[PDB]
Structure formats: structure tokens, C-alpha cells
């Protein structure tokens, strides 16, 4: 099978900015190499066919070159929605093969992050279980740190990150942390705190509630 | 418009069969092949074999064995199945069409079926309100707690709220189980005539769930 | 780097 190196692995470039995906094979494959593009969630959307030829409804700014052994992918103006993973497919020998793909993520002013902290609804409470969500909304770039606190003890390791993707117009992240406790342990505390650091951020922001 | 919807997603105990079901539309099958593509974390996109006009298949050389592609033209159906699953067949399944009848350009695709291989049992989430508490600004969500396995869809509004949504990845609790948790922010002042609510459905237990959230 | 199947996105 022939193997599709594609680099880098993942390609940071500011919008506006011209950006290039290589995609070498193990041999020679003359032009029989199509592109696609996979947006997040998303199945992956035919860019080029055979090495530079057109799609229709794809924008201008996509164009593909090469031949034999190494291929290139081409956005002339990167634009905020054209990140993305970038994959590259040849047909020369059977089986058509697949590159690993190449990340495009894109670079935006630092935003700081608006945070914002959910109690346990009582609902859940019932079940004997009690989380506790903090958001830090639309920032950049992606590293933040956030440090829980109940009754001013330090939590470690029962909370649990998750990050979205870049946002697709105006490139930036959120992230949730949620805190989980035992309703007992809940119930025996009062002050429960989200601190957030980020870049944007000139100090901390905590957000707190007290229980009740 | 041409399109290809596959069925949904599903467990599947290792050492069992998985079948999933591509259904098109805009063309017929007499005229056009139709592939298979996976998609996981170990091996990444990898072409999986071919139903073409007239019926033959191919099949790639490490699933000759244990794949079957079928198809009823009659139904604009095209049924994969494959056997003896272990984990690392847990993929995102695709079914795609070319550009034309004989080519590998894949110009259409299915949405994907997500394929667990597992020996767990499923089970369905419950939902619990985010509830709104700056700038005008109100931030609300609903938290998507303990179902297997993956995915869930999360809609607010049946799909007329879209704008300042974000559905997180899920995470894998300690417990075997996934959480997620979906947010929105909406003007402070739409929180007294609006109403939000969340639309959850987990497909592999059949449970749908509207969460409506409320200040507190 | 690798795909990811709960963010829908490679994951590197």
C-alpha cells in the first residue's frame, strides 16, 4: 500500500495569510492525489481532484500542485472559518489511501475569557451526587488554568476539563471544569470557588456562591 | 440533492457483528458505487471496500474476511456488516459516493456512524439545568451526565437557538460513563420571555429528553 | 496525532 506522509502535523497561521499542506507518498503516484477538508463533527468535504483540478462550490482560495511524489494543498488567503483538518487521498494503486492529516488552526488577538459558575440543581442533589460547573467563554489562546476551591481547601483531581474547538468566525475557545462531589460533602461546605487564570486576564477571576 | 443517511449509531459487543444501513437518495445505486470509509483514533481515514453499479464488491485486503456489503436497489439501501469486532474497530463509519461511477473521488458523503466496541450494557443520561445566575449577558447550559455510550445530540430550542452555543466534548467519568455539558448565553433581559430548553437524544439507549432551564 | 471520536477532530 503506498503511505501518505503529510506535514506538519499541525500548521498555526494568522487570517489573511497564505498557508501550504504537503503530502508526500512512498512513491512516485503521478497526479492521482484528491484533497478534503473535515471541519469539526463534520464528514470530511472534497477540495481538489486529481492534484489541481477544481470542485465545484469550493471558494478560489483552495488550489492543489504537484506530481509524482509531492503534493501541495494551497489556501492563497487563510479566512477564520477554514480551520479545519486537511487530508490527503491517493488513487494510483489499489487501496486508495488516506495521510494522517494536517491540523490548521489559526491565530487571533488574546481574548480574555468570561467565566461564569453553575451550582448543583437540586435535582441532581437527589441522586446523591452534586457537580459543579465553571465556564470560561470565548478566549484565546487555548491555555487556562482553573482552581477549585470549597471552604478554601485546594481541590485536586475530581474535576474535569473539557475544551471546545476554535470557534469558526471568531476563532476563539471555552472550556467547562466540573467539580465533583458526594452530596455529604457538598452539604458539609459552604463556599464554593472557581479561580481562573488566563494571559488576558491582568489577575485571577474567581467566581464563587455560597451553598444556599 | 444527492445525499447519503446513514443509520444510527450503536454498541457493539467485541466479537459480535455490526450492520449499519446507508440509505441515498438523488441518484440510483444502478448508476453509481457506493464505498465504505472508517475513521478511528488508531489507523485515522481507511478505505473499506466498494458495492458497485452492478453489484460486485472489493473488499481492502484486512477485511476480506469478515466484511459483507450488500445492497437493494429497489430501496436505495446499501447494507454493510462486518464481523468478529474488537475495540479497535471503534470508528466513525462512512458511506460515500464519487464524482462518478467508477472513481474513488469522494464527493458525497454519509454523516458517519459512531461505532463503540464494548462489552458494557447502554445506558441513557440524565439532564440537570445550568442555571442562568454580566454586561447583559446570562449564561445557561444543561448538564449531560452518565450515558454509554457515545454520542448524544444536543439541540436548544429544537434548533431555533444556535448562535452563542457550545456543546463540550464529552469526558469519560471514572465510572465508565460519559458527561458533557452544553452552554449558551443569551441577553439577561430574554430570561423573563423566553423560554430555553435544552433537546437531548441519546440514540443507542432511545432516550430523549427537553430539559427546560430556568433561573433559580 | 490522532482522531478523535468525542471532539470530532484530530486530537494531537
Known amino acids: 500500500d503506498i503511505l501518505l506522509t503529510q506535514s506538519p502535523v499541525i500548521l498555526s497561521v494568522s487570517p489573511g495569510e497564505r498557508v501550504s499542506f504537503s503530502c508526500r507518498a512512498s512513491?512516485?503516484?503521478?497526479?492521482?492525489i484528491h484533497w478534503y477538508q473535515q471541519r469539526t463533527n463534520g464528514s470530511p468535504r472534497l477540495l481538489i481532484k486529481y492534484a489541481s483540478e477544481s470542485i465545484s462550490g469550493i471558494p478560489s482560495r483552495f488550489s492543489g500542485s504537484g506530481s509524482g511524489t509531492d503534493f501541495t494543498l494551497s489556501i492563497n488567503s487563510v479566512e477564520s472559518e477554514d480551520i479545519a483538518d486537511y487530508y490527503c487521498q491517493q488513487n494510483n494503486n489499489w487501496p486508495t489511501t488516506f495521510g494522517a492529516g494536517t491540523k490548521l488552526e489559526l491565530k487571533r488577538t488574546v481574548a480574555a475569557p468570561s467565566v461564569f459558575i453553575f451550582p448543583p440543581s437540586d435535582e441532581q442533589l437527589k441522586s446523591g451526587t452534586a457537580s459543579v460547573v465553571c465556564l470560561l467563554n470565548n478566549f484565546y489562546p487555548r491555555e487556562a488554568k482553573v482552581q477549585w476551591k470549597v471552604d478554601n481547601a485546594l481541590q485536586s483531581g475530581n474535576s474535569q476539563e473539557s475544551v471546545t474547538e476554535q470557534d469558526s468566525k471568531d476563532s476563539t475557545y471555552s472550556l467547562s471544569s466540573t467539580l465533583t462531589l458526594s452530596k455529604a460533602d457538598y452539604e458539609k461546605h459552604k463556599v464554593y470557588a472557581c479561580e481562573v487564570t488566563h494571559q488576558g486576564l491582568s489577575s485571577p477571576v474567581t467566581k464563587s456562591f455560597n451553598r444556599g | 440533492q444527492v445525499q447519503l443517511k446513514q443509520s444510527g449509531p450503536g454498541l457493539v459487543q467485541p466479537s459480535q457483528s455490526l450492520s449499519i444501513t446507508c440509505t441515498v437518495s438523488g441518484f440510483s445505486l444502478t448508476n453509481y458505487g457506493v464505498h465504505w470509509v472508517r475513521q478511528s483514533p488508531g489507523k485515522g481515514l481507511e478505505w473499506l471496500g466498494v458495492?458497485?453499479?452492478?453489484?460486485?464488491?472489493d473488499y481492502n485486503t484486512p477485511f476480506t474476511s469478515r466484511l459483507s456489503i450488500n445492497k437493494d436497489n429497489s430501496k436505495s439501501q446499501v447494507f454493510f456488516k462486518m464481523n468478529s469486532l474488537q475495540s479497535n474497530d471503534t470508528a466513525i463509519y462512512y458511506c460515500?459516493?464519487?464524482?462518478?461511477?467508477?472513481?474513488?473521488?469522494?464527493?458525497?458523503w454519509g454523516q458517519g456512524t459512531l461505532v463503540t466496541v464494548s462489552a458494557a450494557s447502554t445506558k441513557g443520561p440524565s439532564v440537570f439545568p445550568l442555571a442562568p445566575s454580566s454586561g447583559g449577558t446570562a449564561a445557561l447550559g444543561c448538564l449531560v451526565k452518565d450515558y454509554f455510550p457515545e454520542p448524544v445530540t444536543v439541540s436548544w430550542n429544537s434548533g431555533a437557538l444556535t448562535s452563542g452555543v457550545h456543546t463540550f466534548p464529552a469526558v469519560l467519568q471514572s465510572s465508565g460513563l460519559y458527561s458533557l455539558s452544553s452552554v449558551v448565553t443569551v441577553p439577561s433581559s430574554s430570561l423573563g420571555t423566553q423560554t430555553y430548553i435544552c433537546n437531548v437524544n441519546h440514540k443507542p439507549s432511545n432516550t430523549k429528553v427537553d430539559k427546560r432551564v430556568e433561573p433559580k | 496525532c490522532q482522531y478523535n471520536l468525542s471532539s470530532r477532530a484530530l486530537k494531537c
Open positions: 460515500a459516493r464519487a464524482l462518478t461511477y467508477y472513481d474513488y473521488e469522494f464527493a458525497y
Open positions: 458495492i458497485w453499479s452492478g453489484g460486485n464488491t
Open positions: 512513491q512516485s503516484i503521478g497526479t492521482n
